[PDB]
Every structure is written in C-alpha cells, then in structure tokens.
Design a protein around this ligand. Structure first.
Ligand SMILES: Nc1ncnc2cc[nH]c12
Ligand SMILES: Nc1ncnc2cc[nH]c12
Lengths: 181, 181
C-alpha cells in the first residue's frame, strides 16, 4: 500500500509554467494513481474525524477533484467556489490576487452556506495564500462564523509563507504534503 | 434515504444563463446534499461494477466533482481533460464547440492514457454532445481503443439529441437523470 510520502514522490515540478519564473507543482500523478489518491484522502479524513464539518468548500477547479472526494468520504455536501460568471443564481463575491494572476473575482452561491455551517475549505496548493484568504472572506460574508472554518491543502509551498498570510483570518490549516527543503 | 428521483427534484433550471436563450441546468444542490450525491454516486458505481474501468476521465471543471468521487469509489485513478493552457507537460489537443461557446480547445496529458486503458468519460451535462465527441477523440489520439471507452453523464437533455451525435464515436452512454418531458 502506498504512503503519503510515496504520493509526494509522484509530484513533478514544471519550470516556467504557465508563465516564466513560476515553478509549477503538477499533482496530476497522485490523482491518476489510486493508491496515492487513497493515501492522501485517508490522511485528510482521519484528520477531521472528530471535527463536525458540515460542508467541504472546494476552491476553484483546482480544488474540485480531491475536494469532492473528501466531501463524499466525510459524508457531507460539496460546495464550489468559482471565478465570477460561472455560478448561476444569487451569489456572494470577492476580488483577490494569486501567485500568477492578479485581479481575480471569486463567487459562491448564497444559499449554499450560512451560520449553521462548519466549513472545510480545500485547495490543491497553498502558495501566496491570496486565494485562500479571499475564500475565507467569501464564506464569512455568506454567514459562516470565523471559528467554524477549517482549511486543508494537498500541497504547501512553505517558502512563500502563505500560512502566515492566511493566519490573519484562519489558523486551522492542515497541509498533507509540504515542499521538500 | 434519498433516491435518484429525489436528487432530480433538486435540480434548478435557470433562464438566460450564462447568455440569453440558454436554459441552464444548475446541479449544485445535488452536490451540496450528501444523500442526493450518494444516490447518484451509487447509481453510477453499480452500473459499472462489472466493467473493467482503469481510469475515469472528467471532462473539464464541470465534470471534476462527481468525476473524482466516482474514480475513488471505483478504486481507479482520475484524469482531467481541460481547456488548453491549464495542463502542464506533454499534451494531446483537440478543438470543438459546445452549446454556449464555439471554438474551445481541450487537452489531456499524454502520459495519463494509453492502449491499456478502459476509460469511463464523465461529464455533468450532455447537451449538444460537442464536448463529449471531442473528448472521445482526445482519448483515442492518446492511444485508448474505441471499444474501451464508456460514457457517463449526470444529466441528459434529450431534446438536443446529443446522444445520437456522440453515437458516431461511442454508443455506451449512461445518463443518471434525463430531463423531464
Ligand atoms: N506554483 C504553483 N503550482 C501549482 N499550482 C499553483 C497554484 C498557484 N500557484 C501554484
Ligand atoms: N444547458 C446547460 N446547462 C448546464 N450545463 C450545461 C453545459 C452545457 N450546456 C449546459
């Protein structure tokens, strides 16, 4: 059976992608390898076994794959947070900046979150933390209480100190894998 | 316990979205309601219980959520098919047209699929079938054999006869829910 470390070994670092100067972390092989995906999924689910999560909020398409898997594994519903224009109906919005794109607008359907929810935010990679900080804000504007937000990321690039950045709004941050030094 | 019909009742039809003249099928409430998501997931997994699927290929972000859930449930890897520019590394490409967007380019990482694979393509909604037809093409260019491709969609809008369109390349098409007449 593969371990989280084995999953880690499947990650590829692609230079100058999408734009030059950006070291892209390709997590694709963890997702296409069942034993590696199970290892990472189990790590997340065990971690929140005693946390009364009511919804998993996947941050953009990048967080949909494992986000959905975790939601179904925990037995809670999944809610998508997407760039503006993709979600229909009443929505809450917020504008932010991420590692290789500045001026993005995220949205969430108003009806999917509120005061009663305990949210597990999920993102594939934690870089500058701009996307996550914006995501916490959105959840809170929708009515989720600050103390009821937890964060999970598959891969953390500690060098960019995104953790401290996000720590201004949420300090319950669990990363499955951290970039090797 | 909710049934597939109950899941169906959670779907909302949004008029003139994203552009006027388009009747958008909002599947969001099935995904945020665990009992409805379980009902649909179970329907898909039972259906392919005896099919030797080796990979689930989710068609764009729209197919990532349930696509990932099905992949992990079946115990196979998940492979993303995305619009051009989003996937890094060597890729196979193809250009198509969908209900409210003409001139889209889809891609798949070359290394994720090949001759040995039995693919379950998954898309959230089957409309004109342009996206699916293009997806089958991509899989085949990557090396997947025509007889080794199966298709699953969560919701089928039969009125647009996408099924016959896709039937030119693949006739193994299972839709969980079909639009009411
Ligand atoms: N360096 C990086 N690698 C992979 N995904 C992201 C997303 C933001 N920054 C990234
Ligand atoms: N009418 C429609 N509703 C929801 N999703 C899609 C995707 C293509 N056409 C659609």
């Amino acid at each position: 059976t593969m371990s989280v470390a084995d999953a880690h070994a499947l990650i590829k670092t692609i230079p100058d992608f999408p734009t030059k100067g950006i070291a892209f972390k390709d997590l694709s092989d963890i997702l296409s390898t069942p034993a590696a995906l199970d290892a990472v999924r189990k790590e997340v689910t065990a971690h929140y076994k005693d946390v009364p999560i009511t919804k998993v909020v996947g941050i953009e398409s990048r967080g949909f794959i494992l986000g959905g898997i975790v939601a179904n594994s925990l037995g809670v519903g999944f809610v998508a947070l997407r760039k503006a224009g993709k979600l229909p109906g009443d929505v809450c919005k917020c504008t932010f900046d991420m590692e290789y794109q500045k001026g993005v607008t995220i949205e969430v359907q108003k009806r999917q979150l509120g005061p009663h929810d305990v949210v597990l935010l999920h993102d594939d990679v934690l870089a500058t933390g701009g996307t996550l900080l914006a995501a916490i804000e959105l959840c809170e504007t929708a009515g989720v209480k600050p103390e009821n937000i937890y964060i999970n990321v598959l891969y953390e690039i500690e060098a960019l100190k995104g953790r401290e950045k996000v720590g201004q709004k949420c300090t319950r941050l669990f990363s499955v894998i951290r970039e090797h030094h």
